[model samples]
Target: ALLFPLCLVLYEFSTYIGNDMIQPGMLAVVEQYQAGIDWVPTSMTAYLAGGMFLQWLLGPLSDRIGRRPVMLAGVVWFIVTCLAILLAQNIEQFTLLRFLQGISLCFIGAVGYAAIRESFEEAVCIKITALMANVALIAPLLGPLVGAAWIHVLPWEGMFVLFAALAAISFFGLQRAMPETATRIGEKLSLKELGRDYKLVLKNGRFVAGALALGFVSLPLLAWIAQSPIIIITGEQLSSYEYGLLQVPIFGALIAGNLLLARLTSRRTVRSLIIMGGWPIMIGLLVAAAATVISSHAYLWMTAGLSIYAFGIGLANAGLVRLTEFASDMSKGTVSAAMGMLQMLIFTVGIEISKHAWLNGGNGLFNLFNLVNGILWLSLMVIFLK
Candidate 1:
């Protein structure tokens, strides 16, 4: 039981290294490989796209066979891809490998969530899910510092080498510990089966609405991570190391939000907490937008606004977890996969849209708020109706 949580935590940690480590290393990779700033975020785009597409197949596959086998296969795939990434001589090669790596890492969350849902009771699942979500946040907190250290002493490729090593360790740990959770395995893989699973999930209005709500709250953070290099580092002329350190406060705020969720779950219903979460996000976005217009210090206002917004994210995320837990026993993996797909798809669109607007000399912060808040409003309508 102890080892199972460790395995899931480490696996979740493994998925996020790609997100945080690559940001600080982007400067080195872009300069050495002669890639432009605009292309750097595509690293995220490709990564997310890979997860969004592959989760459909992997979700059901695990449901058919077992979470352990599928998860182990993904780990091996990750190790191979990370090794291949070290040999990437061009941006095209690097980005393509990142996409493939995403395909490998995708299994971790799909299988892990399925296993958790299978093994735990509803209340225990909620508590575990909250804690696990917070644990995943630690990766972003550590990723840049780790990447900076590697880039200082070794090459940018050292980051991926570390990823491979970590995944290898996780592979052995999970192999020893994670038990089989699927009670009824599907007979065979078929596009028709996949479609049925997806249709079942998509037609669930409450779940879809809750997911969109979570995605809306999450979009700003995703946009920030994708655009941070340009907005914080290039715009303000800060060094990559300094930029990494600055992220500490923003992520700290998010952790605080998660802690608040842990506390409030005892008193508030998930729906009420989600509604409470929405107001702060709207307020924070507006605060950031106004601050961006009025304040000259880019770092101060941006971080402050994000910090406020992150607290709301923590609140809303807990509720989102409750919503995802609504899946049937057999469809648990597929539901988790659908959630991952939706999140990745939203992040990709939000990041790319904000990037395009920034390139056109638009107010990127305002544009991001406008885009995300519009979605949040629609999600709220659905939530209230449901």
Candidate 2:
């Protein structure tokens, strides 16, 4: 129970930096580097891209070396890099630190997920995993509020301070609480054997397809998360507090969706559950997008849009956990890392695509928001076809 929620806390705390990094930090970087947010928050994209790209490498490495050491190193490195950000004097320094932070943080997620699934039985695993999802689900809800609250009293630099503190706490917490969850199946893995396992995971068509299914499911929701704030706060001219307030319903919908998923787990196949949960998400996106386009309105419209997006993610989260258990054929660590890489890759693509679409080449930014979202919903619907 402790490790499960602890992992979730680590996951949540790590990602907490992303939005703040983007708006005030990366957007600030654009303003610093290019003299305007209009040039777009490429620094945020860079951070995410770096993180996603590294996950592909980190996953396999974690599989070879064992989850605990990789995770410990990753968390510590991430915290140290975050401290680097606090002292960073320029956009270049900040961007580099962000990149390092992303790389280091990526491994913890996969390692943590793998740790739990491997450590427990099916029924018990699902419940614990649900709890993990619940903890993670709460982060986006609280992170923005905490961040917005903090910025009121402190500057952007203080954001890194909070990050460092969280990292310190998690680091000590892990040392005191987390045990080695990796159970060796055979002799210690040789580097040559490890490389072969990588090829096997990569070559497996079913696994790849499963990963893509997850990727496609995640794209629009993440795109919406990445861009909705950009659309609402900057485009609608809402204050930070109001912008933070908008996240409440989005998160509430996620919690509702999670509870709904937990209840449905007793009755449905994983695929069927994904389909059921995905419906609201896709529909919600459509509703929010249409609302934004029609009214060109306030944060209220954006809040609804994000709620839809969050619900979609919530559905995906529950189903993904089960799917990971049912479909995974490798060591828990590798499978977990594979899942992480797949997620980060999808997330990176979604944000970059949305940022470009909404900011760079749209006739009406809000309309573009609806259009991008509509396309993602349609894409999610395609999973049912398979």
Candidate 3:
């Protein structure tokens, strides 16, 4: 039982590790491949943008063929892509390979998350999902630091070598222990069937609400990640390292929330968890907004507010996702795909909104988008629960 979620955790960790651990080595990549320095970051863009593709198709495919094959296949493909990065002769191949490796993210969200949802009871699933998030969040925080140290010992390709080795471990455990969460129906997937399920998912008010709420509730954290450099390093005139330190409180709060979720899932109902999780979010946003208006120590108080909101997210996010995943009668993976896609679409819009808000309105409006998200989050929960 533990082995199953552990494998999924490792698999998810490897994607982030592979992506982040190699970031510090990009200068070496540009030097070796004789590519412009621009591709260094653009390579990451390729990788991240690549994450959006294949989510919809892979989920439905998982629903049709069963979870094990698609997940195992995805892991195998990721491993191969990481190793293949070693064979790249130029920046284009390296960037493209990074993009392909990114596609593995789709499988984790679409297939691995869905499998966990289907295979366990809500309490166990919620706990697993929440704790799994801790591991996921920890990677990006530490991966680059580890990568910086790693490059002193080995070449950049060594990072991918390490990635492949870990995936190999996950693949082994997964092969032996992963349950076929989705039963194979031997049904051919056609456009008409795809259309039918997509239509079904869209027409359901609960799903639309739950899915949109997932995206809405995410904006506060997402905006923090996206706009923090401007807010902290530039506006507040803080050092880069201090900017990084600010992430700790917010991230730690989120991690704490996940831990809280893991501890309380047995005692608390899902709806109860959501209620517990909801208030701090709105309150945190309001506090941040007021602090920004005060124009004194706004940055300090803003972090405090974001931390509070993040804590709420930590508690409420998985519950919202759980309900969203359950909102439709279609295959679990397919529903996850739709929800993931909706969340991604909302993220794109929110990212743009945050950028606009901060650039034009400054600190006074940085929390604006998140406040909008919070209102919808609370408003939707009322309707969602009703």
Candidate 4:
């Protein structure tokens, strides 16, 4: 009984570890391959871009074939990409492979999540997804630490070897336990028809607004991850070690939020959870912005604001799922794909604005606060309006 959900969660775990676990070895990969240090971040860029690249196709593809086959394909493909890292003779080749490996993320968000929602009771689905997020969050937190130590015992190639092993195990568990959740498969695939399905998903104003709320809610976290290194490592707000330490408060708060959700979801209504969570987010950012002007401690202000926002995110994660999941009777995969794409596009635009904010080189935190706060309030407004 437990094996099924465990395997599904394992798939989520397996996909994330590949990126962070490989971080410690990235500089080594570039040096060994005779590339400049700049390529290290590029490797990460390639992977993140890859995560967004194929969702447009994969989501609809899964909707047609069934979640099981597509996820299985994702597992096999992930394993192959991890092993393929050993074959990279240059930074260019290695970076390209990382992009291909990043596509594994789609399997979880677009496919695995759709299956979980389809197969479970509403509360069970909420608990699983709420808790499932912790797996991805934990990897980035601890996996990099493990990688720093891990690179000592094994080459960077060994990290991928380990990831390949993880994927391999999840593959078998998934094969044994995953239920086929698609009610029917499309008889034939055509772009014309695929576009039409997506058009239907896009046409629902409530669904579109809900998806935007989902996308906007995530921006502060994404913005912090993208922009913090600039202020911390580059701007010297804190040393390298201390920078990682700063992540603890925010991510941990977010984890605590999920735990709270899993515990209370059975008793609480979904919209109530969202409203309860939503208030703190607005208040958190408001405090954060005010801290910039009123507090002398730069690091603490940024950390405190984001940590509170993260907690609110954890509390409301499943609440947003309700609005998105059954919005229409159309394919869940297509709906998820559209949501993922919208979120990603928002992230793209959001990140670009953050880049300029930091580039302006004055009051960077203030710039972030204003940008994300706008997103936060707009998200709350839409959630209720929809």
Candidate 5:
């Protein structure tokens, strides 16, 4: 029993590290390909686009077949893609492989979360999900730092090799540990059936609202994740190591917020938690805006703004999980998959919009964060006001 959660956490951690560890390597990849910073956002776009289409499919596949087979297959697929990435010679090859890697690893969350929902009571499930979510966030804290260290000693390809090794470890661990947790099996996987499942989910007003609200709350960090390497390392003229250090407290705020969520969820309602969560996001954005207006130090304002926003993320993280899970009753995997698919689509679009802003320069970075923060605030208002 204990090993199962550990295995799930390990799988989740490996899936994220593949993306997170690659940030530092992006600079090296750019230089190797002789590309401009414009290549950064495109790489992220490739990854998200691949997952955007596949997440919904993967979810139902797990529901139909069983979680164990799907989970193991994803791990093996991820390992293969990571190996392919090591052989990539240019940005085009690397970006293409990243897309494939995204497709491969997309199974982790859908199956893992579904298993959690299927395996536990509502209260226990919420706490486990929150803890797993917090643990997963730790990758952001470690990925870049580890990548920076790896690149400092070895070539960027070494990062991919390491990712492959991690995925392999997860594969063996899960092979030994993951049990089939799908409660409803033998669901039809036909296109028409899947379409109906989606339609049913879409028809629900509460689910849509909650999914979009959570997506909006998460948009700032998503944008930052893609834009930060260029903004911090290239624009602000900080070393990758220093940039990694700067993110320590930013991600730490998220961990802290997760702890706070665990505490407050025991006492408060999801609606109340979300309402209170908005305060930090609002304050964080304001600080970022003011810092941009008055200060010349891009680094200071960027860190300050994102750190505070991360705290709000922690606060909302668990509630969002509970909210999205409660959003549908068709199947845990299907509901989680639909929510994941919606967020990936939103992320794909949001990053492109932010890419244009990034092209505008450092001031554009501030403007992008401020704009996203405004949108997030408006989203929260819509959710709560009416």
Candidate 6:
């Protein structure tokens, strides 16, 4: 739980400064100088690319070495990156620093997932996973609000300094108490050995099923984050600040889902929770599609429906972390890395497709969003249920 909040705080803060929250604001300013607003998303792309690559490398390395050392190294690097971002005077420097920030997060996400897997027993692990999943949910909740507050009162550079300080605190705490949780303490893991493990897991049908499931789970979230502000705020000419504020309700639903997951511990099997979560996600997408067809003023419906979808992700992510714990033969590193790779693949594909489909100038083409995500979701459910 301690680690979960710290991870949330650091990630939320860093993400706010780097991409979703602060990056847009910064880009708006830079765009005034004709710095190219389109290039702003390139920083996010860089972050995602770097993060995916390093996460794959680090996950297996952590399994070989230990979760704590990997995490501690990540923590230190996060602090340094935050400082560098704070000191950045040019947009290019900020872009590079954002990319580094993305890479650094691979350690936190993968190693931290590994930590939760090794830390708890079966029943308890679900609750812990639920708690940790809230970090993802609430970070989006708290991050922008706090970030907006800070930006209102101070420079964006100050936001990174604040991130650096928080990261330093997390690093010290980790140094003192983060455990070495790899199964084989001293066993050296060569690239060859890691490759072998990868092949083994890759060959497993169940692992592939799990990986495929990850894509649909995050689809709505990718779209919502990518375009909601434009649709809901800019289209209406309401306050962008108010759009950030509205995220609070969406986050509240996420927290509610986590609490429900923990409380229904006895009845909620991993399969059941996935079902509970997946149903709403599919339904939300359907609602979004209907709204697009029925009314041009559909942003409100989209907002509400996507909130339900995100809540489902919060539930599934928690259970998925716990379910991965069942693979005893899998090294902690491989498991974490594989999950990271799966998520990054989904996110990258979703973002790319969403951007591409939007760019070709198709009018009212919500069908692409629905069709792509719906098929993925249905395919996953059928495979998993079987």
Which 10-residue span in candidate 2 carries the lowest summed lDDT?
20-29
Candidate 3 runs further than 4 Å off = 1-5, 18-49, 63-69, 79-100, 113-133, 140-165, 168-182, 234-237, 262-267
lDDT of 5 by residue, 196-303 (tens): 888999887777766776666677777777777887878778887678888888889988887888788779887777678777877777777667656545667767
Q: Give the TM-scores of the predictions, in the order they appear.
A: 0.89, 0.81, 0.76, 0.79, 0.90, 0.81
State model 3's lDDT.
0.80
Off by over 4 Å in 1: 119-131, 295-297, 324-330, 362-386
Stronger candidate by lDDT (4 vs 5) = 5
Alpha-carbon error at 155 in model 1, in Å? 1.4
Q: By the lDDT metric, which is better: model 1 or model 6? A: 1
lDDT of 6: 0.63
> What ordering of candidates by lDDT runs from best to worst?
3, 5, 1, 4, 6, 2
Clashing pairs in 4: none
lDDT of each: 0.73, 0.62, 0.80, 0.73, 0.75, 0.63
Expressed as tens digits, the lDDT of each residue in 102-201 for candidate 6 is: 7776765677666766875778666655555545565667665665566556666666677677777767666765667777667776877667877887
Which digits, one per residue and each the tens of the lDDT, describe model 4 over residues 1-386?
45667887887777777766665466557667878544554565567667888887876677679989999999999999989989988888998898899888778877787778778899888788656866877976776557656665767788888888988998999899888887559766789987888898888877777777777777777666655544565455555466667777888898888889989989998878887888767777766667665643566776787788889888986677676776767766677788777777666566555555655543445445544644664665555555
Better by TM-score, candidate 2 or 1: 1
For residues 178-261, could you state the per-residue lDDT of candidate 3 as single tens digits?
Answer: 988776558787878777787888999999999989988987786675456456645677754666677778888888888899
Error of 2 at 250 (Å): 1.9
What residue runs in model 4 are displaced by over 4 Å at the alpha carbon?
Answer: 1-4, 22-45, 63-68, 86-95, 113-131, 148-157, 175-186, 227-231, 237-240, 262-269, 286-297, 326-329, 352-356, 359-370, 373-386
* Backbone Cα, N, C clashes tallied per candidate: 0, 0, 0, 0, 0, 2
Give the best candidate by lDDT: 3
Query: What tens-digit string does per-residue lDDT give for candidate 2 at 6-48?
Result: 6546645565555543453333344445545543444555566
Range of the 10 consecutive residues with the lowest summed lDDT in candidate 3: 36-45
Pairs clashing in candidate 5?
Answer: none
